[PDB]
Design a protein around this nucleic acid. Structure first.
Lengths: 74, 340, 20, 73, 74, 74, 341, 20, 76, 72, 76, 71
DNA sequence: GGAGACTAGGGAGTAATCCCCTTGGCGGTTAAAACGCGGGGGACAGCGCGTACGTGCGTTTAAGCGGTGCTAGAGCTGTCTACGACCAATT
DNA sequence: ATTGGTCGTAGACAGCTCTAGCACCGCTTAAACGCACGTACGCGCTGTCCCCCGCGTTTTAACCGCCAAGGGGATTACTCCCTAGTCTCCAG
């Protein structure tokens, strides 16, 4: 549940990078919102998993890069 | 002539997918680049030995590609190296491991295996062919996409740029040739029936056809009558003038030497051009004036051939196969003919 | 093993040209 | 622009993720992860919509991108 | 009377994809029946979601939530 | 992948059966297309699953009536 | 008056959600319909006995609903029975089990639990309130929806139709009331701050408010100043004239008797007074137009939360339903409430 | 169990309405 | 409305609990919730298997039916 | 452990499940079905209890779980 | 290369086959290909878990970390 | 199933770059070995029955690689 | 048959493991503001739709007969009949 | 304490499975056909822009207590590093 329009013009600016004059319909907008929210909740959940795994309550980025390397990110 | 087969694995016993010589070379030593499953592009140094047999010298390794690489292309000036493959990223390498290369522009926009790349004569325009059923036109200086040709309905395994800069010849796996006018940015011609080309049963991942260096004639491999190579002309692209029969396996590659040779006839001009055709397990060498082939080499590779390449002067004819081994064809001083 | 058969420069007849 | 991933918005999304305690540098490494994976997914999405000869992306492109990234939903 | 629009050879080759070899002709009518009843089912929820966005035009996102309701997301 | 024009006729006819003065998106229409395709093919693997348990190759409606009753959508 | 509690389970001990009397009745015997978790709509026959105590007689069972039913409504003429619930299907039952009923039109378009339904005076236009954050206007003769009101941001638990046929009053779980003019089909008034009502913590699934039978005033239960029931007017819908204090549990139901009583602090000034019933979670308060304080109050008659109340056609019966599976009735003698006009 | 407390018709004061 | 012997069920679910986490206190309400879920799902499953066996034309029921139903279910 | 369910109990529950003729090995695959079913439910109950910080498993926890897999 | 003996792998394959259905012959080429894919996958998850433990800032490994990796994969 | 010898596990571990290994490693390694063995053989026989064949073939494992995405 | 390997087994020792600050970065608090939500034309320029076009490979009927559903008779077996013993269970 | 719940035995035969029997309607072309598909393109029109104003809930900064990540050290525990039979995989 990110705030709508800040996210939408994040998407707009990062879409303009490939080539300008790109129009996106609201349908695909909420679709990509669904995609981003699903990914972030999944990654956050797995970070909590590996964090209590790390036997520290507070979150650490090292957990994040760990998850990336296991999830095939880099 | 003499034929020398490379019996040392270039890419650690993995199949070789492409070969290309440096078009910027102007002397006796030519620079060759290779593509393999090892996600690495190896540029080699190829030069004749004292006895005339081909000698291969390793120069550089290009491991930026995350996945397999299918096609490697040099610019007509030889400055920029084009490389794309399974990761579907077209890298414009530049001379910055005996030597080093650096990517200039990232011509991304393709999805998976990119099989055929053809440089335009000016070198500022790219034709990109990949499994993704599309052909994309790019600007080398801009590094950005400018035109799209996605009318293909199957694996786009062959494309070449018109040397005259008027049409675009594309071969897809759907046994259909598509000609794209360069100024209209639409389809110029469509030929599918005299089927004419080979179906999916042909085992080569490539359908690389190339125009004649003058652009007057177009040679297309992987045809049917039986396996053959049809010849088209600029005057009429909807009916082949003649076909070169290749019984056995289907032809997969057409490459023409960039050196114009004197006449010692498919097309009637005072010069003749010698081109190389690679089948799955045999290579036939033809010339412009003589219908029958003046050269034929076979039983030199244990698996299917992938790519061939002529040298800048025509003294080297590299041959790549899918067994991890490559081979070269060496001609003596002007053995093919008298250069113009 | 393979038995190489190489044909030199003869200025093969099984591959003679066929026209239409 | 890029700072649009709002800090307390990150906080509440972490809340929904069951996160306990949150530090500052997360608030922009989340921007990094978001930007890179959206770069990827809208990349193959615009490719998929280019296959359709369509100048606008679709939810179909998005869902195929999720299949290719193994997060089908 | 477009219901008959789903034909004998089409259903036969869907069957080929399905994992059968021999199927009787008496199944085509029940196939169109099951198709029509469950398109009724799905499009009901689809049009509800369409009305939710004050839309007079259906969107591809609607069928997504429709299958989520039906438990067959894709 | 099945066919286009008869299914568009189907969806339009059922739409006017629901209510007139409505519009569909082309992309949404084809999306509905593969959605119905997937649902029917899944039902049909169920059909094959029953028939193999029915230890008969050819199928009679009672297989698909099971499919539906067993999952109980109707 | 007398109060009689139904100690026999109407729907096999399942909680009861709604009650409605046949508005088409015109004599002493009245027809009452009940809805429960058992996916059945039971219409009963309610009539006074020789001693004046209410007597309940079972007439029909309506099991067409696949899931639970939350609201049941009769037409103002009594011809058509409206029933919707968990399966989110609105059925227009009709007299075709001592008797039988058949659904005329299937007014589908809702998604989940439908909580409140109101019949328009003409009987040809429908207001439906459901959890789905919307209210849909339907055509009874056509059997098709014609208008949509999606301004609700939470569970819609109460709706009523203006007897004058000018506005539409809605109550949702968001402590926000929304008024829709029947002509413009847009929001005419909106009140949220005086919070103004009770939040989601209130344990009743219903927020059923009803207009005065003449439409002059609106009675909105489940208010906060402590629990209260605010009153609005057609002159100004953005400010309450007064609120009825009900400390303890929150009021959840408002029903007005369809019989106009003569005059025997005054909420509204016309030569007639109207007696209405307000049901809280465990208490029922009986007011009239002219008196600020209630003239009747019944409590400690049901073991769980009350769900719905209903007045009879003549006002002699006041059915009360609860969530414990048991119902109750309030019986008034001949014109005990007052002398009808 | 519950203890019923019933108040008859008295023509209570805890619920006297307060105006504004 | 239960037939499975309630305290054997309680001991079963408890012994499952300490197989994962030790010293888990369960009340009557949790046990009856686990029960109601139990009989509900099993009666649904047997309804399924019986009707499938009727499709099988065979009076006797054997677990090829239950395996059939679960391979429908997607649980594996 | 899993033997908390008795074979006669299995038989009577099957009998009111509408079946008349039954084989033996059903008494053992039914236990596997039951454990496969209950592991997910108890896992979700543990997750919800940790979310609410209630050590004891409640009725409403199980009810909302059954709502999650959809057999409320 | 190969570091797992052919016969134990083949005999467990035959064990599971006869558990499922008899008269299922296994060819040497397919057996060795499946075995090498087996080794590749297992070693892949193995250094996956190795890196997991490296983050776990404890050089010795304990399999609950591997089970974290499992639910990262979502296999079970 | 016992055939996966624990010293083989340990030498493959030594190849994997680990240094000190807990003893209880072996049983769960074998378990998740056989779960994927089961998945692959299930996909293999799924393709094989459509091929109307009874013998395992390298094409089956190649399609298993394609399906699981490990190619 | 015979030679690498593994399985059974001590040593301690390095590697986890839990305790003890310990402080510094982090969890709620506050004030407002600052973008967040929204809606309304404006019609301009983007968008699909129907139908025409044609024409060609998918769609339709049918022979036709035989691989596959349908019926009979086993026929041999594992319940469920009664029961006699244990036997966990509520208090 | 007893008390209903359970368990395990004995075989009659009901019925699942196997074999034998039978017919009949899916493959399998050959030929008629038709709508499926592809583009234009004029016509419809739907999504829209985007600004600001309205206006208002959340964002951001900073404080202050204080919880916890990590260090230190004592504590146990577990593969060395052979030692040795073995045993069986694989070659001859």
């Amino acid at each position: 549940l990110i705030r709508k329009l800040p996210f939408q013009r994040l998407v707009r600016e990062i879409a303009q990078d490939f080539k300008t004059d790109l129009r996106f319909q609201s349908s695909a907008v909420m679709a990509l919102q669904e995609a981003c929210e699903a990914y972030l909740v999944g990654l956050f959940e797995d970070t909590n998993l590996c964090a209590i795994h790390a036997k520290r309550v507070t979150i650490m980025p090292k957990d994040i890069q760990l998850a990336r390397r296991i999830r095939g990110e880099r | 002539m003499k034929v020398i087969t490379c019996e040392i694995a270039w890419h650690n016993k993995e199949p070789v997918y492409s070969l290309d010589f440096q078009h910027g070379t102007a002397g006796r030593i030519h620079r060759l680049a290779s593509a393999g499953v090892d996600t690495n592009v190896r540029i080699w140094k190829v030069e004749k030995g004292p006895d005339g047999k081909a000698i291969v010298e390793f120069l550089s390794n290009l491991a930026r590609h995350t996945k397999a690489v299918n096609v490697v292309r040099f610019s007509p000036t030889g400055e920029i190296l084009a490389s794309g493959g399974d990761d579907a990223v077209i890298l414009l390498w530049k001379v910055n491991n005996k030597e080093n290369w650096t990517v200039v522009k990232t011509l991304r926009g393709h999805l998976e295996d990119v099989y055929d790349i053809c440089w335009a004569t000016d070198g500022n325009l790219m034709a990109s062919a990949s499994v993704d059923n599309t052909a994309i036109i790019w600007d080398v200086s801009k590094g950005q996409k400018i035109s799209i040709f996605n009318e293909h309905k199957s694996y786009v395994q062959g494309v070449t740029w018109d040397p005259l800069g008027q049409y675009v010849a594309t071969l897809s796996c759907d046994r259909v040739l598509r000609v794209y006018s360069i100024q209209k940015k639409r389809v110029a011609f469509n030929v599918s029936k005299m089927r004419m080309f080979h179906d999916d049963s042909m085992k080569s991942f490539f359908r690389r056809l190339s125009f004649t260096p003058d652009g007057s004639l177009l040679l297309t491999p992987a045809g049917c009558v039986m396996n053959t190579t049809y010849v088209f002309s600029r005057k009429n692209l909807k009916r082949p003038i003649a076909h070169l029969p290749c019984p056995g396996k289907a032809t997969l590659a057409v490459r023409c030497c960039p050196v114009y040779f004197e006449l010692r006839e498919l097309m009637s001009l005072p010069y003749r051009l010698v081109f190389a055709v690679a089948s799955e397990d045999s290579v036939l060498l033809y010339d412009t004036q003589q219908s029958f082939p003046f050269g034929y080499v076979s039983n030199i590779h244990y698996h299917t051939l992938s790519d061939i390449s002529w040298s800048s002067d025509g003294a080297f004819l590299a041959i790549s196969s899918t067994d991890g081994y490559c081979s070269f064809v060496t001609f003596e001083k002007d053995e093919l003919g008298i250069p113009l | 093993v393979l038995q190489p058969v190489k044909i030199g420069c003869v200025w093969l007849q099984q591959f003679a040209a066929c026209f239409l | 622009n890029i700072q649009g991933i709002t800090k307390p918005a990150i906080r509440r999304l972490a809340r929904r993720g069951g996160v306990k305690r949150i530090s500052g540098l997360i608030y922009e490494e989340t921007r990094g992860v978001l930007k890179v994976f959206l770069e990827n997914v809208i990349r193959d999405a615009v490719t998929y919509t280019e296959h359709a000869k369509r100048k606008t992306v679709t939810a179909m492109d998005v869902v195929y991108a999720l299949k290719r990234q193994g997060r089908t939903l």
